[PDB]
Design a protein around this motif. Structure first.
Motif, mmCIF file in Angstrom:
data_model
loop_
_atom_site.group_PDB
_atom_site.id
_atom_site.type_symbol
_atom_site.label_atom_id
_atom_site.label_comp_id
_atom_site.label_asym_id
_atom_site.label_seq_id
_atom_site.Cartn_x
_atom_site.Cartn_y
_atom_site.Cartn_z
ATOM 1 N N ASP A 8 0.836 -1.188 0.000
ATOM 2 C CA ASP A 8 0.000 0.000 0.000
ATOM 3 C C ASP A 8 0.879 1.249 0.000
ATOM 4 O O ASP A 8 2.092 1.186 -0.244
ATOM 5 N N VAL A 9 0.261 2.401 0.276
ATOM 6 C CA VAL A 9 0.995 3.665 0.312
ATOM 7 C C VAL A 9 1.665 3.921 1.651
ATOM 8 O O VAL A 9 2.373 4.926 1.793
ATOM 9 N N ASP A 10 1.463 3.048 2.637
ATOM 10 C CA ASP A 10 2.104 3.173 3.939
ATOM 11 C C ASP A 10 3.074 2.038 4.234
ATOM 12 O O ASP A 10 3.741 2.071 5.273
ATOM 13 N N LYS A 11 3.167 1.041 3.349
ATOM 14 C CA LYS A 11 4.051 -0.112 3.535
ATOM 15 C C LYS A 11 3.745 -0.836 4.845
ATOM 16 O O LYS A 11 4.645 -1.196 5.607
ATOM 17 N N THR A 12 2.456 -1.047 5.114
ATOM 18 C CA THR A 12 2.030 -1.729 6.330
ATOM 19 C C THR A 12 1.057 -2.858 6.009
ATOM 20 O O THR A 12 1.192 -3.969 6.531
ATOM 21 N N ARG A 13 0.077 -2.583 5.153
ATOM 22 C CA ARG A 13 -0.947 -3.553 4.781
ATOM 23 C C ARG A 13 -0.449 -4.373 3.598
ATOM 24 O O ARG A 13 -0.140 -3.818 2.539
ATOM 25 N N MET A 14 -0.376 -5.693 3.782
ATOM 26 C CA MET A 14 0.046 -6.607 2.722
ATOM 27 C C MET A 14 -1.198 -7.107 1.995
ATOM 28 O O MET A 14 -1.758 -8.164 2.294
ATOM 29 N N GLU A 15 -1.636 -6.318 1.011
ATOM 30 C CA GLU A 15 -2.848 -6.654 0.271
ATOM 31 C C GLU A 15 -2.595 -7.702 -0.804
ATOM 32 O O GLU A 15 -3.525 -8.420 -1.191
ATOM 33 N N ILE A 16 -1.364 -7.808 -1.299
ATOM 34 C CA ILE A 16 -1.009 -8.760 -2.346
ATOM 35 C C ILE A 16 0.070 -9.680 -1.801
ATOM 36 O O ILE A 16 1.114 -9.213 -1.330
ATOM 37 N N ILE A 17 -0.181 -10.986 -1.863
ATOM 38 C CA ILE A 17 0.759 -11.994 -1.393
ATOM 39 C C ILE A 17 1.036 -12.974 -2.523
ATOM 40 O O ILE A 17 0.204 -13.179 -3.412
ATOM 41 N N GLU A 18 2.221 -13.579 -2.485
ATOM 42 C CA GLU A 18 2.628 -14.531 -3.506
ATOM 43 C C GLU A 18 3.542 -15.570 -2.871
ATOM 44 O O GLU A 18 4.411 -15.230 -2.064
ATOM 45 N N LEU A 19 3.337 -16.830 -3.241
ATOM 46 C CA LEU A 19 4.114 -17.944 -2.712
ATOM 47 C C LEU A 19 5.181 -18.336 -3.727
ATOM 48 O O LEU A 19 4.859 -18.709 -4.860
ATOM 49 N N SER A 20 6.444 -18.252 -3.318
ATOM 50 C CA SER A 20 7.542 -18.619 -4.201
ATOM 51 C C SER A 20 7.584 -20.129 -4.405
ATOM 52 O O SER A 20 7.136 -20.909 -3.560
ATOM 53 N N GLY A 21 8.136 -20.539 -5.546
ATOM 54 C CA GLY A 21 8.233 -21.933 -5.913
ATOM 55 C C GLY A 21 7.037 -22.467 -6.676
ATOM 56 O O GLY A 21 7.185 -23.402 -7.469
ATOM 57 N N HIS A 22 5.858 -21.895 -6.455
ATOM 58 C CA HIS A 22 4.674 -22.343 -7.171
ATOM 59 C C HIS A 22 4.714 -21.831 -8.611
ATOM 60 O O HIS A 22 5.121 -20.690 -8.852
ATOM 61 N N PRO A 23 4.309 -22.648 -9.587
ATOM 62 C CA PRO A 23 4.379 -22.196 -10.985
ATOM 63 C C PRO A 23 3.442 -21.044 -11.299
ATOM 64 O O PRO A 23 3.774 -20.207 -12.148
ATOM 65 N N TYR A 24 2.279 -20.969 -10.644
ATOM 66 C CA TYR A 24 1.332 -19.887 -10.908
ATOM 67 C C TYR A 24 0.440 -19.740 -9.675
ATOM 68 O O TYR A 24 -0.551 -20.462 -9.538
ATOM 69 N N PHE A 25 0.800 -18.808 -8.795
ATOM 70 C CA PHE A 25 0.054 -18.547 -7.570
ATOM 71 C C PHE A 25 -0.320 -17.074 -7.534
ATOM 72 O O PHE A 25 0.561 -16.211 -7.449
ATOM 73 N N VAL A 26 -1.619 -16.789 -7.595
ATOM 74 C CA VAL A 26 -2.138 -15.426 -7.576
ATOM 75 C C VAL A 26 -3.054 -15.280 -6.371
ATOM 76 O O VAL A 26 -3.953 -16.105 -6.165
ATOM 77 N N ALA A 27 -2.828 -14.234 -5.579
ATOM 78 C CA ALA A 27 -3.643 -13.977 -4.397
ATOM 79 C C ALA A 27 -3.556 -12.499 -4.054
ATOM 80 O O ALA A 27 -2.455 -11.964 -3.890
#
Lengths: 187, 187
Positions: B128-147
């Motif tokens: 976000d604009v405050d670098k506090t809320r993690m609205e977008i997460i992604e798991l490494s190693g997975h071929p296609y992980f969207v969240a």
């Protein structure tokens, strides 16, 4: 094993404006329904089973010319010459004049009992080399009437369609604008 | 009316190398299956029903900044700024830097309980604009992980495909030689 059912199957289609095709082994039954509907000759019946009637139009007469002697079969390398011009089984061959066709039958038409076929609308758009045997007959007034003695089905080449069955579909709906609607999708 | 069946439905697809999509109302259940399989935090359960657990990662915290005061809802015209670069939900927008997206939720992630998400392969390709809320997460190693948290399905314009569902089909078979086979049939 069947002589009555084959008569009512062809006279019913002609009255209901349905076209027919030219198949062999049918000249003996085509002259029966034509003499009873247009005129009224009931004595003319089946001649290939009991040849005892008086109005026997098509009888059994072998070849009395050269090559085959005695009671043989009416077949072989014979030259077929047409008589008229504009028709449905002549314009597809590029306007010929002498086509080589083979037959497979033994009964011939008598030239002395065809008096009632000339005074009506039963023309002959195909004769022989002696102008005696009427191998090709056609009924005027019908939209599409094909009748002969040879077998055009066995000569159905993939590069040359047959005269009779192809002319019936073309003269049905006349749909020729289909080739321009495609365009080769798999190109 | 449903809290246990939604947990076993997402973790079963991740173990069988199947790709997923970024749908909202799923961040509360995504952190439960990740802490039990990669680690073993059984106390972390559902927080939107009974907030009595000790390992409550995502709780209910309203907006404490300007605009909305008190217990409101986390939505409105908010500016979403990404963090990384090469991904699957950023390269389709022509490499932007600040995309305007809207949300529709009320639960936020605590910045003090994300200690175990940084020491593993759980990066954050969107903040976000405050670098506090993690609205977008992604798991490494997975071929296609969207969240994420926003709703890209409602913005599915006919001239601009959506990020998640379009990138899954393209990265499946990579069939791009189909347009050259047609060639405009109706020409």
């Amino acid at each position: 094993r069947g002589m009555e059912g084959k008569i009512r199957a062809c006279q019913w289609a002609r009255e209901n404006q349905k076209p027919l095709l030219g198949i062999c082994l049918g000249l003996q039954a085509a002259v029966i329904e034509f003499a009873r509907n247009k005129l009224g000759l009931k004595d003319a019946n089946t001649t290939e089973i009991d040849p005892n009637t008086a109005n026997a139009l098509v009888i059994d007469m072998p070849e009395h010319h050269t090559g085959q002697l005695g009671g043989t079969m009416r077949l072989g390398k014979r030259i077929t010459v047409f008589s008229d011009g504009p028709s449905v089984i002549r314009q597809l061959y590029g306007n010929p004049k002498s086509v080589q066709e083979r037959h497979r039958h033994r009964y011939e038409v008598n030239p002395k009992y065809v008096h009632l076929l000339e005074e009506q609308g039963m023309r002959f758009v195909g004769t022989d080399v002696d102008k005696t045997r009427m191998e090709i007959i056609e009924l005027s007034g019908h939209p599409y009437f094909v009748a002969t003695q040879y077998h055009p089905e066995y000569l159905s080449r993939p590069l040359k369609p047959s005269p009779p069955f192809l002319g019936l579909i073309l003269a049905s709906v006349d749909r020729l604008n289909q080739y321009i609607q495609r365009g080769c999708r798999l190109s």
